[PDB]
Structure 1
Amino acid sequence: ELVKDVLNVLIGVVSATFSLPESISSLLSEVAEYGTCYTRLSHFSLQPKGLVFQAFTSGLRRYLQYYRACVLSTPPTLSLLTIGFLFKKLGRQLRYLAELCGVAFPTGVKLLSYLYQEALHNCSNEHYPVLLSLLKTSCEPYTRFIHDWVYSGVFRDAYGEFMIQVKLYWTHGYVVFLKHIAHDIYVCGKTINLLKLCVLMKRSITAPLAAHISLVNKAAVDYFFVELHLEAHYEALRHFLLMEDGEFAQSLSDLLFEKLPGELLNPLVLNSVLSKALQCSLHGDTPHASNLSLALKYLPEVPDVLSCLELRYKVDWPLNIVITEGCVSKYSGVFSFLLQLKLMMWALKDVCFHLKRTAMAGSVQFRQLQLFKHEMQHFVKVIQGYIANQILHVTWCEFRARLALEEIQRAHAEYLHKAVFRGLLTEKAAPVMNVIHSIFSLVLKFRSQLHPNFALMQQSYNTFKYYSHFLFKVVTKLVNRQPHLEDFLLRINFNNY
């Protein structure tokens, strides 16, 4: 009858006319060449390189068996033409699966995403369910690795199909699905790995996932405050580095300035002056109060306004990862300025005290002399009042009502950066800082000449009044081009021009 011959070609077994009127051969090739793709699949999807490729390979055999189930089920012996028409709406789909595979071929995520773009490309048509059932199982193992960083945190990779592979401790290199969740997964895992050492709407994935991301991060930040006192370290480093606590800088700087080369630089005096300083603090002497390594960074040789010296805080592991080893370096930048400021309010205090013992001696030469100090002191006691208003109070209002895990890195990087910006240390407003040195220098010369050389000092003060009068113009011209500098005008200029 020949029915059992054509039907035994979709299975792959050869026949009397299938090797490996008269026009029936042409209409036979319409069903024959269908079989050439069925065999061309088992030769390609037989193995049980990549793990996601195996599942997609394991998904194909979940389909062909149905194609083997449909055949040999309905027709015992039907008309010849019935076969060609019955296997048309289904046969052409089998030839479509040849365009998908080879009969090179991506692997890993590159394949799990390539198959996705085949869905939207041919969505409305009848190829939607078959492709979907493949994608629904071709991503099954890939969810498991995603199901590790979310629940357990053990990274299980074999060949690199995962898009992510494996002091600083944050060198798990990272670089389709919605990127709104991609970068979040990368951080939703590193937190767990850090606590261990201490229509195509994708709703079936994010919904069981986003519910767990917010609980981890909230428990991660809460882990820091209520147990490791992150809120304390900030409000403690400010007590020591930014010199917020009086009776400490006025005891440290006051000690060092008593000396001024080979002395004052061995670790016997400068590494001990701190342990004498902390006792006069009336605040501290806690586990926080330690780790104040008063270390130096230069070996100078020999009237100026510079004494290079550093003061570094020290931290331990679960806090080292937040407070960057670069941020503390910038505290050292803002510190050497603030210490340099105290050198004025002590040297200027000296001449105010050095002159006190001189007092009978009342003449025009005397009173006209002392009014210089009153005219120079008021300037420094103004620029200091500015610093003690921006870098310690208002920039601290932010970053204190701002906090209440990635954000902690940026919020801190924004707190200090505003402190060095309002501090006239940025290179943008550098000329405003350069002129300050001319002011500070002249006060030191005024300290050297503690009336044998009055006129030598009278010329010095006149140079001071010129430079100060020059500052009022260079800062004003820098307003048309910084709302931070605005408050300086109201500070330097008041009831004058």
Structure 2
Amino acid sequence: LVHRILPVAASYSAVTRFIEEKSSFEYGQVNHALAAAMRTLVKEHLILVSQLEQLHRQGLLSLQKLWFYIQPAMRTMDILASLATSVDKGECLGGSTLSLLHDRSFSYTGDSQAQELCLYLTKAASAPYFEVLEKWIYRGIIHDPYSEFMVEEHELRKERIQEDYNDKYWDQRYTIVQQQIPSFLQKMADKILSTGKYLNVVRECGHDVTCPVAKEIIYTLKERAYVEQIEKAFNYASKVLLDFLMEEKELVAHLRSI
């Protein structure tokens, strides 16, 4: 019975080590949030052990009772330890450890005891990435201090300057990354790059391409509101594109004088 109770301790120490090692700056912004929302469950585990110790103080707890008492938390710790092991094993960072969290939520679809945990981890870990996507979608800036966001900006001005030989803005300045796509936004991946690349060629010229409203975006499972959000921003930005190319750096006179 001791041996049958012990797997939660093996699924406690390995759980803590994950949270200590992948809190460093190097592993990226989303791997920080995953362990940062995983440590709260360790606090709640400690809270459980406090109550069990008090009952043990009053001589009113037995090993056979402790068995049933610890069953609800054993499952949570098993899910967290397996997810931690997989995130470590794949060397997943950025969106590669935002796709795995979305897929594991599908994996348990009927359970509802481990499922709710998995959605809570994905909601917690998707907060920074959706902030970067909000910035990218509603303004041309890509803050992205670490290489995690799917869209990337090469400093291709070095070669293309004075004359834009390559048409870099439309060709190879603002480009996409493949392995850092969240696997739930893959349907919108190209549209996103288009959405913000369109913004940049007016945000670069001084004229301000502001949105009507910068709708905050957050992950949700079974609900695709972000999908329509991405279309909404794409539509309006693509509309202001003619509100630049015909207003400042006016194309009509330039074509006439060609």
TM-score norm. by structure 2 comes to: 0.72
Is 1:157 the equivalent of 2:178?
A: no
Is 1:215 the equivalent of 2:202?
A: no
Equivalent position to 1:46, from 20, 26, 30: 20
**Corresponding residue number in structure 1 for 2:159:** none
Measure, in 2, the Cα distance between the counterparts of 1:178 and 1:144: 14
Residues 232 and 201 of structure 1: CA distance in aligned 2, closer, same or farther (over 3 Å): farther
Instruction: For 2:147, give the aligned amino acid.
Output: G
Alpha-carbon deviations, 1:113-171, whole Å to 9, x = none?
11211111111112111011110011111112112122332222233111222221222
Residues 44 and 179 of structure 1: CA distance in aligned 2, closer, same or farther (over 3 Å): closer
Structure 1 spans left out of the alignment, 5+ residues? 1-26, 237-287, 289-312, 314-497
**Corresponding residue number in structure 2 for 1:116:** 102
Instruction: For 1:118, give the aligned amino acid.
Output: R
**Corresponding residue number in structure 2 for 1:190:** 197
**Corresponding residue number in structure 2 for 1:336:** none
Residues 149 and 95 of structure 1: CA distance in aligned 2, closer, same or farther (over 3 Å): closer
**Corresponding residue number in structure 1 for 2:8:** 34
CA contact (8 A) 2:108 2:115 kept: yes
Task: Give identity over the alignment, percent.
Answer: 24
**Corresponding residue number in structure 2 for 1:91:** 74
Instruction: For 1:98, give the aligned amino acid.
Output: A
Instruction: For 1:69, give the aligned amino acid.
Output: I
**Residue aligned with 2:199, SS:** helix
Equivalent position to 1:179, from 186, 195, 202: 186
CA contact (8 A) 1:149 1:192 kept: no
Matches within 5 A, 1:275-286: none
**Residue aligned with 1:90, SS:** helix
**Residue aligned with 1:43, SS:** helix
CA contact (8 A) 2:175 2:193 kept: no
Measure, in 2, the Cα distance between the counterparts of 1:187 and 1:91: 46
CA contact (8 A) 2:108 2:114 kept: yes
Worse-matched range after superposition: 214-223 or 93-102 = 93-102
Alpha-carbon deviations, 1:58-86, whole Å to 9, x = none?
11102211122222125522132111012
Measure, in 1, the Cα distance between the counterparts of 2:238 and 2:105: 35
**Residue aligned with 2:50, SS:** coil
Residues 230 and 95 of structure 1: CA distance in aligned 2, closer, same or farther (over 3 Å): same
Measure, in 1, the Cα distance between the counterparts of 2:34 and 2:79: 17
Task: Quote how far apart the aligned CAs of 1:226 are.
Answer: 5.1
Residues 220 and 81 of structure 1: CA distance in aligned 2, closer, same or farther (over 3 Å): same
CA contact (8 A) 1:51 1:141 kept: yes
**Corresponding residue number in structure 2 for 1:147:** 134
Residues 200 and 216 of structure 1: CA distance in aligned 2, closer, same or farther (over 3 Å): same
Measure, in 1, the Cα distance between the counterparts of 2:126 and 2:35: 12
Worse-matched range after superposition: 29-38 or 53-62 = 29-38
CA contact (8 A) 1:109 1:162 kept: yes
Is 1:66 the equivalent of 2:44?
A: yes
Measure, in 2, the Cα distance between the counterparts of 1:231 and 1:132: 52
Alignment size in residue pairs:
211
Task: Quote how far apart the aligned CAs of 1:107 are.
Answer: 1.3
**Corresponding residue number in structure 2 for 1:225:** 246
Instruction: For 1:40, give the aligned amino acid.
Output: A
Task: Quote how far apart the aligned CAs of 1:112 are.
Answer: 0.8
What's the C-alpha RMSD, in Å, of the aligned pairs? 2.4
Larger Rg: 1
Task: Quote how far apart the aligned CAs of 1:97 are.
Answer: 2.7
TM-score norm. by structure 1 comes to: 0.39
Measure, in 1, the Cα distance between the counterparts of 2:65 and 2:99: 40
Alpha-carbon deviations, 1:303-329, whole Å to 9, x = none?
xxxxxxxxxx5xxxxxxxxxxxxxxxx
Task: Quote how far apart the aligned CAs of 1:222 are.
Answer: 3.0
**Residue aligned with 1:216, SS:** helix
Query: Higher relative contact order at CA 8 Å, sep ≥6: structure 1 or structure 2?
Result: 2
Measure, in 1, the Cα distance between the counterparts of 2:96 and 2:227: 21
Residues 200 and 73 of structure 1: CA distance in aligned 2, closer, same or farther (over 3 Å): same
Structure 2 spans left out of the alignment, 5+ residues? 154-163, 178-182, 206-219
Alpha-carbon deviations, 1:4-42, whole Å to 9, x = none?
xxxxxxxxxxxxxxxxxxxxxxx0112223112212221
Residues 94 and 226 of structure 1: CA distance in aligned 2, closer, same or farther (over 3 Å): closer
